[PDB]
Amino acid sequence: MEAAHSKSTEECLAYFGVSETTGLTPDQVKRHLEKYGHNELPAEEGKSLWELVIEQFEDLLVRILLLAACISFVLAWFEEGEETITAFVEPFVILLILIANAIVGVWQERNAENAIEALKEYEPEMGKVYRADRKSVQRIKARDIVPGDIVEVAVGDKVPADIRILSIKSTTLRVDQSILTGESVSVIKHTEPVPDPRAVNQDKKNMLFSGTNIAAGKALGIVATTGVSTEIGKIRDQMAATEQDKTPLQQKLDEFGEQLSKVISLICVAVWLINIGHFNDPVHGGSWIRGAIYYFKIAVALAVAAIPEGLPAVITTCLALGTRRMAKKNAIVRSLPSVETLGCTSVICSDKTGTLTTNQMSVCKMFIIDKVDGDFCSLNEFSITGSTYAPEGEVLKNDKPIRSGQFDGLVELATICALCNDSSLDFNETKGVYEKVGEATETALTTLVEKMNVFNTEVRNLSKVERANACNSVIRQLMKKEFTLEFSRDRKSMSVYCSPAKSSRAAVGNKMFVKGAPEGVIDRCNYVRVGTTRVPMTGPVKEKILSVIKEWGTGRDTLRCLALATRDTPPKREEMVLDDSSRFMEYETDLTFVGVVGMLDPPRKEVMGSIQLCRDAGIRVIMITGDNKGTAIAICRRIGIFGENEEVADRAYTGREFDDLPLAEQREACRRACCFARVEPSHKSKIVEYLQSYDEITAMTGDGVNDAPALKKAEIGIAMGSGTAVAKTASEMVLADDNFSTIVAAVEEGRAIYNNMKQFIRYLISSNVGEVVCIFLTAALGLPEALIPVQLLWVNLVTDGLPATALGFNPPDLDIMDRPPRSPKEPLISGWLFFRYMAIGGYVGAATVGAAAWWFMYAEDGPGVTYHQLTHFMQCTEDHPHFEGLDCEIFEAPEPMTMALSVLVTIEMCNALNSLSENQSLMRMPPWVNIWLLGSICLSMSLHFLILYVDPLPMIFKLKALDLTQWLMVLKISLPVIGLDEILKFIARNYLEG
Numbered sequence: 001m002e003a004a005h006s007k008s009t010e011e012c013l014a015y016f017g018v019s020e021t022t023g024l025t026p027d028q029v030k031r032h033l034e035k036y037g038h039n040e041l042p043a044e045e046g047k048s049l050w051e052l053v054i055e056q057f058e059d060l061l062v063r064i065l066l067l068a069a070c071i072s073f074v075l076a077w078f079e080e081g082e083e084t085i086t087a088f089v090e091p092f093v094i095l096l097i098l099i100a101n102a103i104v105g106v107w108q109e110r111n112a113e114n115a116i117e118a119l120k121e122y123e124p125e126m127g128k129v130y131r132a133d134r135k136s137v138q139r140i141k142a143r144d145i146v147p148g149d150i151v152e153v154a155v156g157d158k159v160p161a162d163i164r165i166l167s168i169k170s171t172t173l174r175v176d177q178s179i180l181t182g183e184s185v186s187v188i189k190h191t192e193p194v195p196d197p198r199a200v201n202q203d204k205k206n207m208l209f210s211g212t213n214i215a216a217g218k219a220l221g222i223v224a225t226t227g228v229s230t231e232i233g234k235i236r237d238q239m240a241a242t243e244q245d246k247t248p249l250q251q252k253l254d255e256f257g258e259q260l261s262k263v264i265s266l267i268c269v270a271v272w273l274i275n276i277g278h279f280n281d282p283v284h285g286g287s288w289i290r291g292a293i294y295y296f297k298i299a300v301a302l303a304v305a306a307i308p309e310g311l312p313a314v315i316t317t318c319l320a321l322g323t324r325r326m327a328k329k330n331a332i333v334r335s336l337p338s339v340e341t342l343g344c345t346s347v348i349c350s351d352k353t354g355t356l357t358t359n360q361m362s363v364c365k366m367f368i369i370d371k372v373d374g375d376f377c378s379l380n381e382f383s384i385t386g387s388t389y390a391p392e393g394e395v396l397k398n399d400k401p402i403r404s405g406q407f408d409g410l411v412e413l414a415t416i417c418a419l420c421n422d423s424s425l426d427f428n429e430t431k432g433v434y435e436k437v438g439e440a441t442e443t444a445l446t447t448l449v450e451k452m453n454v455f456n457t458e459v460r461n462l463s464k465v466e467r468a469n470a471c472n473s474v475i476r477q478l479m480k481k482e483f484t485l486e487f488s489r490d491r492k493s494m495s496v497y498c499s500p501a502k503s504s505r506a507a508v509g510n511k512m513f514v515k516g517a518p519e520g521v522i523d524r525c526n527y528v529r530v531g532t533t534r535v536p537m538t539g540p541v542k543e544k545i546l547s548v549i550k551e552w553g554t555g556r557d558t559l560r561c562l563a564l565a566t567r568d569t570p571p572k573r574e575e576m577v578l579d580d581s582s583r584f585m586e587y588e589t590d591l592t593f594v595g596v597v598g599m600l601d602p603p604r605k606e607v608m609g610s611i612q613l614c615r616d617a618g619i620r621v622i623m624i625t626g627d628n629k630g631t632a633i634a635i636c637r638r639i640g641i642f643g644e645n646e647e648v649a650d651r652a653y654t655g656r657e658f659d660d661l662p663l664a665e666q667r668e669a670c671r672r673a674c675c676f677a678r679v680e681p682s683h684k685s686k687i688v689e690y691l692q693s694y695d696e697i698t699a700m701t702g703d704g705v706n707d708a709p710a711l712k713k714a715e716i717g718i719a720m721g722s723g724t725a726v727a728k729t730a731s732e733m734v735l736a737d738d739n740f741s742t743i744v745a746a747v748e749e750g751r752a753i754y755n756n757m758k759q760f761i762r763y764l765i766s767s768n769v770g771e772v773v774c775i776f777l778t779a780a781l782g783l784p785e786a787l788i789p790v791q792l793l794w795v796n797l798v799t800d801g802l803p804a805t806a807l808g809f810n811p812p813d814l815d816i817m818d819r820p821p822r823s824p825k826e827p828l829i830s831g832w833l834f835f836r837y838m839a840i841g842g843y844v845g846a847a848t849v850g851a852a853a854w855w856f857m858y859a860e861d862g863p864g865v866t867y868h869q870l871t872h873f874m875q876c877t878e879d880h881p882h883f884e885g886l887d888c889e890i891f892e893a894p895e896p897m898t899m900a901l902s903v904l905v906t907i908e909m910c911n912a913l914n915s916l917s918e919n920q921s922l923m924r925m926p927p928w929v930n931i932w933l934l935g936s937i938c939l940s941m942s943l944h945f946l947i948l949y950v951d952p953l954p955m956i957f958k959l960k961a962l963d964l965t966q967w968l969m970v971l972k973i974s975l976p977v978i979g980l981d982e983i984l985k986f987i988a989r990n991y992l993e994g
């Protein structure tokens with residue numbers, strides 16, 4: 001059943017061929033069940049951590065090692081009858097690093113909770129039907145409802161499916177549709193058609209939508225659609241959409257992953273080319289094995305060298321410290337990578353109600369008549385502060401404070417608010433806050449009455465639970481509410497019939513106390529109360545009143561306005577017929593006007609300030625609200641999204657206006673406009689999609705089920721601490737305390753993380769380029785092994801890891817928030833900076849070959865053929881009597897390596913100091929500054945000795961502790977590094993850009 005709202009009740013009945021009075025036969029039920037399925041959202045399991053691990057190896061750069069390890073395991077096995085008792089470390093360290101790293105990656109995006117599980121909580125298990133085979137309402141499983149079912153719902157039901165309402169049994173049906181609108185206000189249903197086929201939820205006043213709940217009354221309807229075809233079904237489909245998302249930063253990292261590998265691959269042809277360059281002279285005397293494994297020896301080494309294994313630990317650690325400082329701010333970060341995202345965000349879309357606002361309806365203004373004299377009428381106007389339901393607040397006249405009980409008019413106003421009311425207030429002792437019981441607009445009246453305290457009741461000493469309704473009980477003691485003329489559509493108001501407590505049924509002094517929509521109520525007054533007197537309602541008194549009502553209704557006041565009145569001489573109860581609501585407007589006539597109250601749902605107090613700081617960081621703030629446009633706008637103005645008088649014709653839309661724009665126009669409207677009102681959940685994610693199609697990194701902030709699709713679709717979803725579970729579990733971050741200031745601090749953190757990552761990516765890859773450069777020289781110069789895989793894995797996980805993690809501990813830049821955000825198209829490392837790690841790289845590459853190549857020559861400790869003849873590790877015994885005169889097993893020595901690796905280390909240590917500042921020479925920013933980094937260098941340095949001295953280690957990594965002379969050379973070749981970056985740091989600070 002499509003478009004049931006745009007037809008008549010009989011058209012919907014006829015449509016399925018059912019009587020409203022008997023229901024489906026159980027044959028119809030069978031058929032309809034086969035044809036439409038069951039009435040439930042399908043579960044989404046969500047990937048079990050086997051399939052995640054497996055997916056971690058789905059990208060090249062890991063597959064590249066997963067391949068290696070195997071070949072190092074091919075090599076691990078086919079080891080000569082020599083170093084046999086641990087040739088296997090290579091394969092296994094490697095394969096263990098794979099798992100580790102891959103575990104970390106899955107772990108950091110954690111999260112059991114499942115947003116569809118949370119959302120099926122709004123599926124009732126039971127619903128109620130009429131069907132042909134029994135006369136009375138049957139109470140079956142909700143999932144067994146089919147389209148065409150006659151269903152009944154009543155107070156506190158969860159609506160089990162999407163239903164066209166057939167008849168309303170009570171005088172009104174009041175619905176809470178907050179899962180589709182964000183708003184808890186009751187919607188007053190009716191049964192007429194709503195012909196517009198494009199009507200939005202807010203407009204389908206003749207439908208019940210599944211998962212909302214009935215706040216008052218009783219209704220029968222016909223099911224139109226069920227399961228996945230409902231409004232909650234749409235929300236569910238958009239939260240499925242699990243197109244594996246990555247942050248902006250993760251994608252960058254991946255781009256960078258893909259480039260690293262299309263390095264490694266080109267270097268292996270290159271290393272395969274200078275090899276097949278001298279493949280034309282093997283003197284063929286030792287099998288094509290000695291060369292077969294000469295690739296997949298340096299081809300493993302080429303991978304271990306180029307990959308910065310390690311990045312994942314120090315990156316994960318970086319994020320993890322950010323996440324911990326955001327905890328101190330009461331921002332919980334559910335997904336470690338999103339602790340960075342807001343740092344590059346350019347647009348923040350925000351829900352209003354409960355997010356930007358407190359979602360506590362408050363009476364902020366009221367008035368009564370002051371004085372009347374022919375055409376002269378003045379008002380007493382008052383303001384009331386407080387924006388929670390808590391009874392804390394004061395009443396002002398002119399911004400000076402007053403005692404309400406001194407105005408007789410305020411006394412009667414409070415009286416009407418307390419009696420003409422079906423809600424109350426509760427203190428929630430577990431949560432330590434006041435909470436409404438019943439409707440927000442009514443509860444507003446309750447808190448008002450408690451802030452007026454018109455009879456000077458003593459409340460300083462009441463427990464908070466007792467305080468919740470102290471003043472109201474006082475008023476209830478004066479006057480007994482006998483019955484309510486409940487609210488009806490034809491009169492726009494409601495009343496309560498009351499007798500003085502302590503009077504007899506026959507006595508005089510019965511009153512009706514009326515509240516409602518100002519116009520109808522003001523027309524039914526013939527009098528105005530002045531103090532404790534009464535005078536005739538006249539044209540200019542009415543005119544005066546309507547005048548400020550008008551104003552209050554339409555500023556960036558734009559307040560919900562209620563008139564309060566009293567029937568001084570109501571009819572005798574006997575004369576009233578209660579069962580006939582159509583009679584009620586007449587019973588509510590000959591009224592005395594008393595006062596007007598103006599309420600709104602107010603912004604949280606830090607929002608205005610937060611919006612202005614986003615603006616300073618170049619972030620746009622856009623409101624997407626299920627609520628109506630006039631409040632949307634008015635609030636945008638109170639919080640600085642619009643200036644107090646900006647014109648906003650082309651800058652604010654309803655759902656329905658937006659749906660009338662063409663595609664190109666909609667898309668443009670998301671750049672031009674700042675206020676989107678009366679929308680559906682789909683509109684929110686659609687606006688997000690459009691903003692993202694200009695390549696903006698887009699955030700979503702909110703609290704509702706109606707927000708979940710947009711939070712999921714944004715680059716980051718931020719949920720409020722007091723909102724729904726559904727919103728919370730679609731989010732990456734939660735503001736536990738609801739402080740929107742935290743957003744701005746989250747931006748600051750974000751930028752600071754990006755900067756860290758830049759600085760220790762540059763610092764580590766540097767190292768990485770030097771090792772590729774050694775390995776490609778202990779090759780194209782047929783040279784003995786300068787550095788081995790077991791070793792680079794150590795420098796690359798640990799000795800570089802401790803400092804890289806230590807550069808972490810920088811206090812952020814002073815100026816990171818005064819600057820728009822980085823463009824999505826700004827590469828990680830680029831330009832100067834790439835050149836600058838390159839040059840570091842090569843110098844390492846050339847420095848490590850050397851210190852090896854110079855414990856082979858100039859080095860008293862192993863005088864080798866000092867005219868470059870060290871190139872031939874081929875003709876060992878092969879040409880033993882050639883250019884020789886001593887040993888044979890001298891290349892496999894640890895020394896050439898222990899000088900080679902000692903330099904790859906001492907060089908990266910200095911680099912760890914260069915690296916404290918991208919540009920400010922070590923001269924001007926002293927290198928003692930970050931202590932933890934020097935700390936880190938001692939940890940690293942000492943560890944480097946553990947592998948030279950602690951008995952077992954110097955065999956695995958094949959080393960030997962060095963002569964004092966030895967280090968002092970390592971040190972003569974490493975210390976220059978500093979003056980190297982320095983020439984790159986003068987050139988930067990100056991003859992470059994500045």
Ligand SMILES: Nc1ncnc2c1ncn2[C@@H]1O[C@H](COP(=O)(O)OP(=O)(O)OP(=O)(O)O)[C@H](O)[C@H]1O
Nearest residue numbers: 187188202487492493494515516517560561562628
């Ligand atoms: N219990 C009540 N007591 C007094 N007045 C009420 C009561 N309930 C509703 N009203 C008044 O009459 C209306 C009730 O809702 P209505 O169907 O007219 O929707 P609406 O306010 O015009 O907005 P929307 O565009 O979201 O449909 C007013 O908005 C409101 O202030």
Ligand SMILES: CC(=O)C1=C(O)N2[C@H](C1=O)[C@H]1c3c[nH]c4cccc(c34)C[C@H]1C2(C)C
Nearest residue numbers: 056061062097098101102105253257309311
């Ligand atoms: C086993 C596994 O899950 C992983 C890891 O083990 N790693 C990283 C990683 O994600 C790999 C990776 C992907 N993209 C980049 C960019 C920069 C650095 C790295 C990566 C490290 C890669 C590897 C294999 C060390």
Ligand SMILES: [K+]
Nearest residue numbers: 711712714717
């Ligand atoms: K998201």
Ligand SMILES: [Mg+2]
Nearest residue numbers: 056101102105
């Ligand atoms: Mg991974």
Ligand SMILES: [Mg+2]
Nearest residue numbers: 182353354704
């Ligand atoms: Mg909300």
